[PDB]
A = this chain, B = another copy of it.
């Protein structure tokens, strides 16, 4: 009943409630992410601001026992037929909306040290994303370098960077250089860095779920148009949890501007935007049938599957039912590429016997 073995390019780890309470310098402790559970309500506070209010029902729906207990997580991976799994933050993501570079740097060190010592230590099937400062390039380079010396394979960046720190700016060049030198995949996860509760009228739930795409597409356009990827041929970028089929559409959109608006284009690129996307830009999805069409009809081979465990928008606990229906009638080479091989190009886990 779990016959199709998968690697998951997207999932999340819930941090211990006291992670920052115990480990931060006393001056910083009270400003770290912290939650109050009262009335029906969880309220999350970050550095003197309420950043989140939810009824406990929804909050706790994304908190099955594996989302917390790493021993149960590994058993859920077996149960769902997932071998290797990339693990992103939950509360740690709020470091991306902080305005104080020192609070962000120190909260990121704590998170990165806990994830490696207390979680990535349980199984080599776990590939964690180290956070790096969104606010200061020297802080982000130093932590990437420390995280890599510790055996991290990828860094997390928020899809919406702080104002004036868009991904086409010169300020990021030292980070691209260090990531390329380290062999570090840059993982950009959507729904991070900002607020995505922008739509309030009829259809808000569906409209807001679409709005979170825009920073993902913008990030790809900035990395491609700025020459960041062109200048760093070894630099690979994963766009996590934005789906896949918009990526070749965007490759075509950029090619059209590059070719028809060339007289306004700076910098020039050594190859077309679409060639950079197809070489270096990867994208994950959970349910999207269109991800298979991207590979088979749009020559976009950089599609990875993800469970996004334990989010509502992920596959858990119906991983096998989802993927078996997704890949019914599909070339096994394509199913292998999307569910296993793109994962192992990016990330190192112990190799299974590759059944076709």
Let me know if B260 and A313 touch, CB within 8 A: yes
Q: Is A206 a contact of B249 with CB atoms below 8 Å?
A: no
Of the candidates B221, B286, B293, the one whose C-beta lies within 8 Å of that of A206 is B221
Q: Chain B CB within 10 Å — which of A166, A206, A256, A293 has the most?
A: A206
Mark contacts of A260-287 with chain B using CB atoms, 8 A cut-off: 1 yes-contact digit, 0 otherwise.
Answer: 1101111100000100000000000111
Give which listed residue, B199, B227, B266, B298, contacts A293 with CB less than 8 A.
B298
A296 to chain B, nearest CB (A): 5
Interface string of A43-70 (1 = CB under 8 A from B): 0000000000001011111000000000
Q: Mark A171-209, 1 if CB is under 8 A from B, else 0.
A: 000000000000000000000000001010111111101
CB proximity of A53 to chain B, nearest CB, Å: 14
- Per assembly, the copies of the chain total 2
Chain A contact residues (Cβ within 8 angstroms of B): what range?
Answer: 35 or more
User: Which of B61, B203, B253 contacts A224, CB < 8 Å?
Assistant: B203
**Contact residues of A with B, CB < 8 Å?**
55, 57-61, 166, 168-170, 197, 199, 201-207, 209-211, 213-214, 217-218, 221-222, 224-227, 243-246, 248-261, 263-267, 273, 285-294, 296-298, 312-314
Can you spell out 19 A-B residue pairs with CB atoms less than 8 angstroms apart? A168-B201, A202-B267, A203-B224, A203-B267, A205-B257, A206-B221, A206-B224, A206-B225, A207-B222, A210-B217, A210-B225, A245-B249, A246-B249, A246-B250, A249-B249, A252-B289, A256-B287, A290-B298, A296-B297
